[PDB]
Each structure stands twice: as structure tokens, then as C-alpha cells.
Amino acid sequence: ASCLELALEGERLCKSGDCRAGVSFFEAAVQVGTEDLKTLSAIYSQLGNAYFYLHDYAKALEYHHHDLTLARTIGDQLGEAKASGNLGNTLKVLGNFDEAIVCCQRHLDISRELNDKVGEARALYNLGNVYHAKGKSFGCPGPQFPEEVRDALQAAVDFYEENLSLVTALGDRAAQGRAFGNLGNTHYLLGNFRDAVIAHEQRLLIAKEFGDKAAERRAYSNLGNAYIFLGEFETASEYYKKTLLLARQLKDRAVEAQSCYSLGNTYTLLQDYEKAIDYHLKHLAIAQELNDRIGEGRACWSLGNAYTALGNHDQAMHFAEKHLEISREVGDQRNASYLKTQVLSPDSLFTAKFVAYNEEEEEEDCSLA
């Protein structure tokens, strides 16, 4: 009634990049009420997704659960599947991987049963994400591997391949490229590097045939990372440079920094310690500009190593010591966990951070319009 009118204003506002407004309208909408439980389900779903977008994952979870419940009572299978998929993604963010699996699985099963192809795909992707998050959530999230990380990332791989084959036979490209990204990453972490090279190459190809802003940067980055883990230091450096150009255009201090750090790491591998020290210095200036103490510490360390390799004693001492203090802040030092004496080299790699970028969540949508 007015519930509908209100909800439509909310949907309009969210659509137009004003989530907080839209949410206040959805809240008024629920507060008024409707006997049309399909559209009430829509209001619940949209609220769920809006709160997700706003990084209030608690409310997100709640509203998606009401949506799920609702769907189930009125026996709306499709509603139930899409609500369940949103629940799965919310849970993934909250780190409840088991329920997230149960939920995204349900999404898939139902979507199959309803002979929905697009939906089936989406749920497959999500399952790949859940297994990717799960895989990363044990110890250090890098490319190196207990039986658990193995199982979960391998599972991730499979799901990424079911998805990939199926959005291959549906002629979705944006989808295929997202799956290629995340599959490149999952290979990357798994140790199967050439495959990662392949798939990353593909994701690059599609971000290219769309002209994707702020998302070419990331295929660059991940290619660079794989090459660094093979030996192609030089070419990787080129890639990261690209990424830094881009990032400094778009005004993102973050990927600016990470691009610098990655770069410096590459010239330290390239034995050009001067350019290395420069890049890591820029990263130091960005990092301490943003109250990023852990970043500041890692810069301190990398620079200490580069200076030491360069012959400069004083700067090495100073930076090593600053790094000590910064470590003392972020933890205990009665076991001296801060002290890492092995330097970055072709035989190390694991000694420095190389940030990789995963894609995104493909959410599930109800509309009243």
C-alpha cells in the first residue's frame, strides 16, 4: 500500500547510490506492513543487501534470515534460494564457513532443481569463494600447506571449474573472467603456478574486452605475483609500475603503497638496491600517513635490508630499531618473534608480502519495480 510506495522510494534511492536513505525508507516500509508477503520478502532482501553494502553484516544477516524464513513459509523456492545465497555470503564475511557452505549449497541445489542456469552458476561461484576464504583462514594466507588448506583450496578449484565450464556454455564473459581471476588466485596459493599464469592471462583478456577501470590494476598485480614466484622479476616490475600509475590516477593511497612495496621487493630481487630504497621510502610515507603501523614496520624492515645490502650502516641501524619498536607495539617480544634475519631473495619469497586481489561477491536481488 503505502508500504509499497515507501519500499519503491527506498529501492530508487539505493539504486541511485544513496543506501542510507533507501534503508530508512525500507525501515518505514516494514514498519507500515503489507499482507503481500512476496513484496515483504523483497523489502527484507533489499534491506539485507543494503546493510551488507554498508558493512553492518549483523543486520544484513538478520534481514536475510527473515527473508529466508518468509520465503520458506509461503513456499517460495526461488526466494528461498536467493535468500540462502545471500545468507551464505554474509556468513562467509562473518567467518562462519560451515553455515555459509550449507547456505550456498542450498542456493545451488535449489537453483539446479528449478533448472535455473544463471543461478546455478552464481551459487557455484559463491561456493568457490567460501572455500577460498576457508582456505585462507588457516595460518599465513600465502602461496606455499597442511592437509586442510590443501583440501579447501582444491575444493575451491573444482567449484571454480564447474562454474567456469557452465558460464562458458552460457556465453557470459564478465562471469568467466571473475572465475578466471579467483581461479588464478586459488592456483597461486595452491602452488600450481603455470595454471595461475594461464587463467590470470584470461581474466586480463576480459577486463580488456570490457575496458575495466580499477579492475585491470588487479589482473596486473596478480600476474606480477605469479611471475615473481616463477622468476620473471623484470616483467613483474613492469606490471607493478603499470598498477602504480593507475592507482595514483584514481587517488587510492592503498594500491599506490602496495604497488610501491611490491616494486621495491622486485628491485631488491633485481639487485638494484637504489630504486628499491626509493620505492620502499614512498611506501613508508604513504603507510605512516594513514596510521598503518604494520605497513610502517614492514617498510622499516625491507629498507633496513636494502640499506644493509647497499653499504649504509647508520640507516640500517635506525630502521632496524624503529622496526623493533613498531613490532613491540603489535605484540609480545619475550620470545622475540619480531626478529627475522633471513633476507628477501630468489630462495626466500616467503620473507616478504605480495598482495593478491580477489574478485567480488555476486549478490542475489529482489526488485519491486
Short mmCIF file of all heavy atoms in Angstrom, two decimals, residues 224 228 231-242 244 258-282 302-303 305-307 309-310 343-346 349 352-354:
data_model
loop_
_atom_site.label_atom_id
_atom_site.label_comp_id
_atom_site.label_asym_id
_atom_site.label_seq_id
_atom_site.Cartn_x
_atom_site.Cartn_y
_atom_site.Cartn_z
N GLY A 224 51.89 -10.18 -12.06
CA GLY A 224 53.15 -9.84 -11.42
C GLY A 224 53.54 -10.82 -10.33
O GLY A 224 54.66 -11.31 -10.31
N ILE A 228 56.81 -13.25 -10.35
CA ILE A 228 57.76 -13.17 -9.24
C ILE A 228 57.95 -14.55 -8.63
O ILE A 228 59.05 -14.91 -8.22
CB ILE A 228 57.30 -12.19 -8.12
CG1 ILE A 228 57.31 -10.74 -8.61
CG2 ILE A 228 58.23 -12.29 -6.93
CD1 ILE A 228 58.62 -10.00 -8.31
N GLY A 231 60.14 -16.42 -11.61
CA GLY A 231 61.48 -15.88 -11.78
C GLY A 231 61.50 -14.60 -12.60
O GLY A 231 62.48 -13.86 -12.60
N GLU A 232 60.40 -14.34 -13.31
CA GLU A 232 60.36 -13.17 -14.17
C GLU A 232 60.20 -11.88 -13.37
O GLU A 232 59.16 -11.21 -13.42
CB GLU A 232 59.23 -13.31 -15.19
CG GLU A 232 59.59 -14.23 -16.36
CD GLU A 232 59.09 -13.68 -17.68
OE1 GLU A 232 59.24 -12.46 -17.89
OE2 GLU A 232 58.55 -14.46 -18.50
N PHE A 233 61.26 -11.55 -12.64
CA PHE A 233 61.28 -10.36 -11.79
C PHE A 233 61.05 -9.08 -12.61
O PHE A 233 60.15 -8.29 -12.30
CB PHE A 233 62.62 -10.28 -11.04
CG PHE A 233 63.01 -11.56 -10.32
CD1 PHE A 233 64.23 -12.19 -10.59
CD2 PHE A 233 62.19 -12.11 -9.35
CE1 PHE A 233 64.61 -13.36 -9.93
CE2 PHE A 233 62.57 -13.29 -8.68
CZ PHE A 233 63.78 -13.91 -8.97
N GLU A 234 61.85 -8.89 -13.65
CA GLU A 234 61.77 -7.71 -14.53
C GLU A 234 60.34 -7.39 -15.02
O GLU A 234 59.80 -6.30 -14.76
CB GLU A 234 62.70 -7.92 -15.73
CG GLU A 234 62.63 -6.85 -16.80
CD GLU A 234 63.13 -5.49 -16.31
OE1 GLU A 234 64.24 -5.44 -15.73
OE2 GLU A 234 62.41 -4.49 -16.53
N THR A 235 59.75 -8.34 -15.72
CA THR A 235 58.42 -8.16 -16.31
C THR A 235 57.37 -7.85 -15.26
O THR A 235 56.46 -7.02 -15.47
CB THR A 235 57.99 -9.40 -17.10
OG1 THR A 235 58.31 -10.57 -16.33
CG2 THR A 235 58.72 -9.44 -18.46
N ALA A 236 57.52 -8.53 -14.13
CA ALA A 236 56.66 -8.32 -12.98
C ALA A 236 56.75 -6.85 -12.53
O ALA A 236 55.72 -6.19 -12.30
CB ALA A 236 57.04 -9.25 -11.85
N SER A 237 57.98 -6.35 -12.45
CA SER A 237 58.22 -4.95 -12.11
C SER A 237 57.47 -4.02 -13.06
O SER A 237 56.83 -3.06 -12.63
CB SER A 237 59.72 -4.64 -12.13
OG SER A 237 60.25 -4.78 -13.43
N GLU A 238 57.56 -4.31 -14.36
CA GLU A 238 56.80 -3.53 -15.35
C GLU A 238 55.31 -3.48 -14.99
O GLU A 238 54.71 -2.39 -14.88
CB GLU A 238 56.99 -4.11 -16.75
CG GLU A 238 58.45 -4.13 -17.21
CD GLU A 238 58.74 -5.21 -18.25
OE1 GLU A 238 57.78 -5.85 -18.74
OE2 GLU A 238 59.93 -5.42 -18.57
N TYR A 239 54.74 -4.67 -14.79
CA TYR A 239 53.34 -4.82 -14.37
C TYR A 239 52.96 -3.94 -13.17
O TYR A 239 51.94 -3.22 -13.19
CB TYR A 239 53.04 -6.26 -13.98
CG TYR A 239 52.73 -7.22 -15.11
CD1 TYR A 239 53.50 -8.36 -15.29
CD2 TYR A 239 51.64 -7.02 -15.94
CE1 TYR A 239 53.20 -9.27 -16.30
CE2 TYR A 239 51.33 -7.92 -16.96
CZ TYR A 239 52.12 -9.05 -17.13
OH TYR A 239 51.84 -9.96 -18.14
N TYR A 240 53.77 -4.03 -12.11
CA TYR A 240 53.50 -3.31 -10.87
C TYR A 240 53.60 -1.80 -11.10
O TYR A 240 52.83 -1.03 -10.52
CB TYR A 240 54.48 -3.73 -9.75
CG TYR A 240 54.34 -5.17 -9.29
CD1 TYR A 240 55.46 -5.96 -9.07
CD2 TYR A 240 53.09 -5.73 -9.06
CE1 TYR A 240 55.34 -7.27 -8.64
CE2 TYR A 240 52.96 -7.05 -8.64
CZ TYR A 240 54.09 -7.81 -8.43
OH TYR A 240 53.97 -9.11 -8.01
N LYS A 241 54.54 -1.39 -11.94
CA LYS A 241 54.66 0.01 -12.32
C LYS A 241 53.33 0.46 -12.92
O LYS A 241 52.75 1.45 -12.46
CB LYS A 241 55.81 0.23 -13.30
CG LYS A 241 57.03 0.90 -12.67
CD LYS A 241 58.22 0.99 -13.63
CE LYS A 241 59.54 1.10 -12.87
NZ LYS A 241 60.71 1.32 -13.77
N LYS A 242 52.85 -0.29 -13.92
CA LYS A 242 51.53 -0.03 -14.52
C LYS A 242 50.50 0.22 -13.44
O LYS A 242 49.87 1.29 -13.38
CB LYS A 242 51.06 -1.20 -15.39
CG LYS A 242 52.01 -1.64 -16.47
CD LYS A 242 51.43 -2.85 -17.20
CE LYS A 242 52.38 -3.35 -18.27
NZ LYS A 242 53.74 -3.58 -17.70
N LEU A 244 50.77 1.00 -10.38
CA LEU A 244 51.02 2.20 -9.58
C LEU A 244 50.61 3.49 -10.30
O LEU A 244 50.09 4.43 -9.68
CB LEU A 244 52.50 2.28 -9.18
CG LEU A 244 53.03 3.60 -8.63
CD1 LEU A 244 52.29 4.02 -7.35
CD2 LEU A 244 54.53 3.52 -8.38
N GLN A 258 50.90 -0.42 -1.74
CA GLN A 258 51.15 -1.83 -2.07
C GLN A 258 51.93 -2.00 -3.39
O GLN A 258 52.77 -2.90 -3.51
CB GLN A 258 49.82 -2.59 -2.13
CG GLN A 258 49.06 -2.60 -0.79
CD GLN A 258 47.54 -2.49 -0.93
OE1 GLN A 258 46.83 -2.22 0.04
NE2 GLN A 258 47.04 -2.69 -2.15
N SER A 259 51.69 -1.12 -4.36
CA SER A 259 52.42 -1.18 -5.62
C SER A 259 53.87 -0.81 -5.40
O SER A 259 54.76 -1.43 -5.98
CB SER A 259 51.80 -0.25 -6.66
OG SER A 259 50.44 -0.57 -6.89
N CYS A 260 54.10 0.22 -4.58
CA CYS A 260 55.46 0.59 -4.19
C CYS A 260 56.18 -0.56 -3.49
O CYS A 260 57.28 -0.94 -3.90
CB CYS A 260 55.45 1.82 -3.26
SG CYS A 260 55.43 3.43 -4.09
N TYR A 261 55.57 -1.10 -2.44
CA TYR A 261 56.15 -2.20 -1.69
C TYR A 261 56.52 -3.37 -2.60
O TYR A 261 57.67 -3.79 -2.64
CB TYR A 261 55.19 -2.67 -0.60
CG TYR A 261 55.89 -3.47 0.47
CD1 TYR A 261 56.52 -2.85 1.54
CD2 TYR A 261 55.95 -4.86 0.40
CE1 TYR A 261 57.17 -3.59 2.52
CE2 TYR A 261 56.60 -5.61 1.37
CZ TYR A 261 57.21 -4.96 2.43
OH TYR A 261 57.86 -5.69 3.39
N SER A 262 55.53 -3.89 -3.31
CA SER A 262 55.76 -4.90 -4.35
C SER A 262 56.95 -4.54 -5.29
O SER A 262 57.78 -5.39 -5.63
CB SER A 262 54.46 -5.10 -5.15
OG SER A 262 54.37 -6.38 -5.74
N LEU A 263 57.03 -3.27 -5.68
CA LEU A 263 58.08 -2.81 -6.59
C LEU A 263 59.46 -2.94 -5.98
O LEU A 263 60.36 -3.60 -6.54
CB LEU A 263 57.84 -1.35 -6.99
CG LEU A 263 56.94 -1.09 -8.19
CD1 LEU A 263 56.65 0.40 -8.30
CD2 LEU A 263 57.57 -1.63 -9.47
N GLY A 264 59.62 -2.28 -4.84
CA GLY A 264 60.84 -2.32 -4.06
C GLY A 264 61.27 -3.75 -3.85
O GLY A 264 62.44 -4.07 -4.01
N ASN A 265 60.32 -4.62 -3.53
CA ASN A 265 60.64 -6.03 -3.41
C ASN A 265 61.21 -6.58 -4.72
O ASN A 265 62.14 -7.40 -4.72
CB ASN A 265 59.41 -6.84 -2.99
CG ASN A 265 59.20 -6.84 -1.47
OD1 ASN A 265 60.11 -6.56 -0.69
ND2 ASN A 265 57.98 -7.17 -1.06
N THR A 266 60.69 -6.10 -5.84
CA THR A 266 61.18 -6.62 -7.11
C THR A 266 62.60 -6.14 -7.44
O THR A 266 63.41 -6.90 -7.96
CB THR A 266 60.25 -6.27 -8.26
OG1 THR A 266 58.90 -6.61 -7.90
CG2 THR A 266 60.66 -7.06 -9.50
N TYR A 267 62.91 -4.88 -7.13
CA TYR A 267 64.26 -4.38 -7.40
C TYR A 267 65.27 -4.92 -6.39
O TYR A 267 66.46 -5.04 -6.71
CB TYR A 267 64.29 -2.85 -7.42
CG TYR A 267 63.69 -2.28 -8.69
CD1 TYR A 267 62.92 -1.13 -8.66
CD2 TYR A 267 63.88 -2.92 -9.90
CE1 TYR A 267 62.36 -0.63 -9.82
CE2 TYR A 267 63.32 -2.43 -11.07
CZ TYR A 267 62.56 -1.28 -11.02
OH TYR A 267 62.00 -0.77 -12.17
N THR A 268 64.81 -5.24 -5.19
CA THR A 268 65.66 -5.93 -4.23
C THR A 268 65.97 -7.31 -4.78
O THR A 268 67.07 -7.83 -4.59
CB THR A 268 65.01 -6.05 -2.85
OG1 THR A 268 64.77 -4.75 -2.32
CG2 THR A 268 65.92 -6.78 -1.89
N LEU A 269 65.00 -7.91 -5.48
CA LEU A 269 65.29 -9.16 -6.18
C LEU A 269 66.11 -8.90 -7.44
O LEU A 269 66.92 -9.74 -7.85
CB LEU A 269 63.99 -9.88 -6.52
CG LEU A 269 63.23 -10.39 -5.30
CD1 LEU A 269 61.74 -10.41 -5.56
CD2 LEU A 269 63.75 -11.78 -4.90
N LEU A 270 65.92 -7.73 -8.04
CA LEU A 270 66.66 -7.34 -9.24
C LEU A 270 68.04 -6.78 -8.92
O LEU A 270 68.77 -6.33 -9.81
CB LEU A 270 65.86 -6.31 -10.05
CG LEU A 270 64.75 -6.90 -10.92
CD1 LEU A 270 64.15 -5.83 -11.82
CD2 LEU A 270 65.29 -8.08 -11.73
N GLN A 271 68.38 -6.80 -7.63
CA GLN A 271 69.68 -6.36 -7.13
C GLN A 271 69.95 -4.86 -7.34
O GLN A 271 71.04 -4.36 -7.05
CB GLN A 271 70.79 -7.20 -7.76
CG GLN A 271 70.52 -8.71 -7.71
CD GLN A 271 71.65 -9.49 -7.05
OE1 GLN A 271 72.10 -10.52 -7.56
NE2 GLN A 271 72.11 -9.01 -5.90
N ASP A 272 68.95 -4.14 -7.83
CA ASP A 272 69.01 -2.68 -7.92
C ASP A 272 68.51 -2.10 -6.60
O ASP A 272 67.34 -1.73 -6.48
CB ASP A 272 68.18 -2.17 -9.10
CG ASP A 272 68.16 -0.64 -9.22
OD1 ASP A 272 68.64 0.08 -8.31
OD2 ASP A 272 67.63 -0.15 -10.24
N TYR A 273 69.40 -1.99 -5.63
CA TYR A 273 69.00 -1.60 -4.29
C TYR A 273 68.60 -0.13 -4.17
O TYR A 273 67.83 0.23 -3.28
CB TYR A 273 70.12 -1.93 -3.31
CG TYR A 273 70.42 -3.40 -3.31
CD1 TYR A 273 71.54 -3.90 -3.93
CD2 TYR A 273 69.55 -4.29 -2.71
CE1 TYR A 273 71.81 -5.24 -3.95
CE2 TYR A 273 69.80 -5.64 -2.72
CZ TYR A 273 70.93 -6.11 -3.34
OH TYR A 273 71.18 -7.46 -3.35
N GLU A 274 69.09 0.71 -5.07
CA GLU A 274 68.76 2.14 -5.03
C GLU A 274 67.27 2.39 -5.29
O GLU A 274 66.57 2.98 -4.44
CB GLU A 274 69.62 2.90 -6.04
CG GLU A 274 71.11 2.98 -5.68
CD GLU A 274 71.41 3.99 -4.58
OE1 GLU A 274 70.48 4.72 -4.17
OE2 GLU A 274 72.57 4.06 -4.11
N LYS A 275 66.78 1.94 -6.44
CA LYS A 275 65.37 2.10 -6.79
C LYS A 275 64.48 1.41 -5.76
O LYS A 275 63.36 1.86 -5.46
CB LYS A 275 65.09 1.56 -8.20
CG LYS A 275 65.60 2.44 -9.34
CD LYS A 275 65.16 1.91 -10.70
CE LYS A 275 65.71 2.76 -11.84
NZ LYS A 275 65.15 2.36 -13.16
N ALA A 276 64.99 0.30 -5.23
CA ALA A 276 64.33 -0.43 -4.16
C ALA A 276 64.11 0.46 -2.95
O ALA A 276 62.98 0.58 -2.44
CB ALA A 276 65.15 -1.65 -3.79
N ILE A 277 65.19 1.10 -2.48
CA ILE A 277 65.11 2.00 -1.34
C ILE A 277 64.15 3.16 -1.60
O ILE A 277 63.38 3.55 -0.71
CB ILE A 277 66.49 2.56 -0.97
CG1 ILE A 277 67.39 1.46 -0.42
CG2 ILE A 277 66.37 3.65 0.09
CD1 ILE A 277 68.77 1.94 -0.01
N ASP A 278 64.17 3.71 -2.81
CA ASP A 278 63.23 4.77 -3.19
C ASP A 278 61.77 4.33 -3.03
O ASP A 278 60.99 4.95 -2.28
CB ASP A 278 63.45 5.21 -4.65
CG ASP A 278 64.85 5.76 -4.89
OD1 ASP A 278 65.47 6.31 -3.95
OD2 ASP A 278 65.31 5.66 -6.05
N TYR A 279 61.41 3.27 -3.74
CA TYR A 279 60.05 2.74 -3.71
C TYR A 279 59.57 2.45 -2.29
O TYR A 279 58.47 2.87 -1.90
CB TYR A 279 59.97 1.49 -4.56
CG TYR A 279 59.84 1.80 -6.02
CD1 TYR A 279 60.51 1.06 -6.98
CD2 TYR A 279 59.04 2.85 -6.45
CE1 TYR A 279 60.38 1.34 -8.34
CE2 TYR A 279 58.90 3.15 -7.80
CZ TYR A 279 59.57 2.39 -8.74
OH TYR A 279 59.43 2.69 -10.08
N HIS A 280 60.41 1.77 -1.52
CA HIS A 280 60.05 1.46 -0.13
C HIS A 280 59.95 2.71 0.73
O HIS A 280 59.23 2.72 1.74
CB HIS A 280 61.06 0.49 0.48
CG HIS A 280 60.84 -0.93 0.08
ND1 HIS A 280 59.79 -1.68 0.55
CD2 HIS A 280 61.55 -1.74 -0.74
CE1 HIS A 280 59.86 -2.89 0.03
NE2 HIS A 280 60.92 -2.96 -0.75
N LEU A 281 60.67 3.77 0.36
CA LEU A 281 60.55 5.04 1.06
C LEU A 281 59.19 5.69 0.79
O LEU A 281 58.56 6.24 1.70
CB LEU A 281 61.68 5.98 0.67
CG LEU A 281 62.91 5.90 1.56
CD1 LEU A 281 64.14 6.42 0.84
CD2 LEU A 281 62.68 6.67 2.86
N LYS A 282 58.75 5.63 -0.46
CA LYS A 282 57.44 6.18 -0.82
C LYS A 282 56.35 5.42 -0.07
O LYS A 282 55.44 6.02 0.51
CB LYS A 282 57.21 6.12 -2.33
CG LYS A 282 58.06 7.11 -3.12
CD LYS A 282 57.42 7.43 -4.47
CE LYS A 282 58.07 8.64 -5.12
NZ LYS A 282 57.35 9.00 -6.38
N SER A 302 62.11 -3.88 5.26
CA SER A 302 62.58 -4.02 3.87
C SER A 302 63.69 -3.02 3.54
O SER A 302 64.64 -3.32 2.80
CB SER A 302 61.43 -3.85 2.87
OG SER A 302 60.68 -5.05 2.74
N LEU A 303 63.56 -1.84 4.12
CA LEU A 303 64.51 -0.76 3.90
C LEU A 303 65.79 -1.00 4.66
O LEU A 303 66.87 -0.71 4.17
CB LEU A 303 63.89 0.58 4.30
CG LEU A 303 63.05 1.25 3.22
CD1 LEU A 303 62.29 2.44 3.75
CD2 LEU A 303 63.94 1.67 2.06
N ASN A 305 66.98 -3.90 5.22
CA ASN A 305 67.67 -4.91 4.43
C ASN A 305 68.33 -4.32 3.20
O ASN A 305 69.48 -4.63 2.88
CB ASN A 305 66.71 -6.02 4.00
CG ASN A 305 66.24 -6.88 5.15
OD1 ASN A 305 67.03 -7.39 5.93
ND2 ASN A 305 64.94 -7.05 5.26
N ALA A 306 67.61 -3.44 2.50
CA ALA A 306 68.15 -2.82 1.29
C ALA A 306 69.37 -1.93 1.60
O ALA A 306 70.39 -2.01 0.93
CB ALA A 306 67.07 -2.02 0.58
N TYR A 307 69.24 -1.09 2.62
CA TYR A 307 70.35 -0.25 3.06
C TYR A 307 71.57 -1.07 3.45
O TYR A 307 72.69 -0.73 3.07
CB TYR A 307 69.93 0.60 4.26
CG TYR A 307 69.37 1.96 3.88
CD1 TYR A 307 68.00 2.17 3.83
CD2 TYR A 307 70.22 3.02 3.59
CE1 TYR A 307 67.49 3.41 3.49
CE2 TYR A 307 69.71 4.26 3.26
CZ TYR A 307 68.35 4.45 3.21
OH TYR A 307 67.84 5.69 2.87
N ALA A 309 72.34 -4.00 2.36
CA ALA A 309 72.91 -4.54 1.13
C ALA A 309 73.65 -3.45 0.36
O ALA A 309 74.51 -3.74 -0.47
CB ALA A 309 71.83 -5.17 0.28
N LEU A 310 73.32 -2.20 0.66
CA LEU A 310 73.88 -1.06 -0.07
C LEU A 310 75.18 -0.54 0.52
O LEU A 310 75.93 0.16 -0.15
CB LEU A 310 72.87 0.07 -0.13
CG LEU A 310 73.03 0.99 -1.34
CD1 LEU A 310 72.82 0.22 -2.63
CD2 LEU A 310 72.07 2.17 -1.26
N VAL A 343 66.88 -12.59 4.73
CA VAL A 343 66.53 -11.50 3.84
C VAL A 343 65.83 -12.01 2.61
O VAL A 343 65.87 -13.19 2.29
CB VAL A 343 67.75 -10.72 3.38
CG1 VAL A 343 68.62 -10.39 4.56
CG2 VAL A 343 68.52 -11.52 2.34
N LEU A 344 65.20 -11.07 1.90
CA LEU A 344 64.49 -11.37 0.68
C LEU A 344 65.43 -11.81 -0.44
O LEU A 344 66.41 -11.13 -0.74
CB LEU A 344 63.67 -10.16 0.26
CG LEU A 344 62.89 -10.23 -1.05
CD1 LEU A 344 62.01 -11.47 -1.12
CD2 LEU A 344 62.06 -8.99 -1.19
N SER A 345 65.14 -12.96 -1.04
CA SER A 345 65.94 -13.50 -2.14
C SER A 345 65.14 -14.51 -2.98
O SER A 345 64.08 -14.97 -2.55
CB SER A 345 67.21 -14.15 -1.58
OG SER A 345 66.96 -15.42 -1.02
N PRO A 346 65.65 -14.84 -4.18
CA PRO A 346 65.09 -15.91 -5.02
C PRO A 346 64.87 -17.23 -4.30
O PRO A 346 64.08 -18.05 -4.77
CB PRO A 346 66.16 -16.07 -6.10
CG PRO A 346 66.67 -14.69 -6.29
CD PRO A 346 66.64 -14.04 -4.92
N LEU A 349 61.31 -15.37 -0.85
CA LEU A 349 59.97 -15.07 -1.32
C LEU A 349 59.04 -14.98 -0.13
O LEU A 349 58.36 -13.97 0.06
CB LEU A 349 59.50 -16.16 -2.29
CG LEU A 349 60.04 -16.08 -3.72
CD1 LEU A 349 59.31 -17.05 -4.63
CD2 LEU A 349 59.94 -14.66 -4.25
N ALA A 352 58.67 -11.81 2.35
CA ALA A 352 58.02 -10.52 2.06
C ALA A 352 56.56 -10.70 1.61
O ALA A 352 56.18 -11.76 1.11
CB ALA A 352 58.80 -9.77 1.01
N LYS A 353 55.75 -9.66 1.79
CA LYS A 353 54.32 -9.74 1.47
C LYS A 353 54.06 -9.34 0.02
O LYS A 353 54.51 -8.29 -0.44
CB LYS A 353 53.48 -8.87 2.42
CG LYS A 353 51.95 -8.96 2.20
CD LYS A 353 51.17 -8.43 3.42
CE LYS A 353 49.84 -9.18 3.66
NZ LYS A 353 49.22 -8.99 5.03
N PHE A 354 53.34 -10.20 -0.69
CA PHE A 354 52.91 -9.89 -2.05
C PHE A 354 51.40 -9.98 -2.12
O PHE A 354 50.85 -11.09 -2.11
CB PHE A 354 53.55 -10.84 -3.06
CG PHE A 354 55.01 -10.57 -3.31
CD1 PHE A 354 55.89 -11.61 -3.55
CD2 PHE A 354 55.50 -9.27 -3.28
CE1 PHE A 354 57.25 -11.36 -3.76
CE2 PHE A 354 56.84 -9.02 -3.50
CZ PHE A 354 57.72 -10.06 -3.74
#
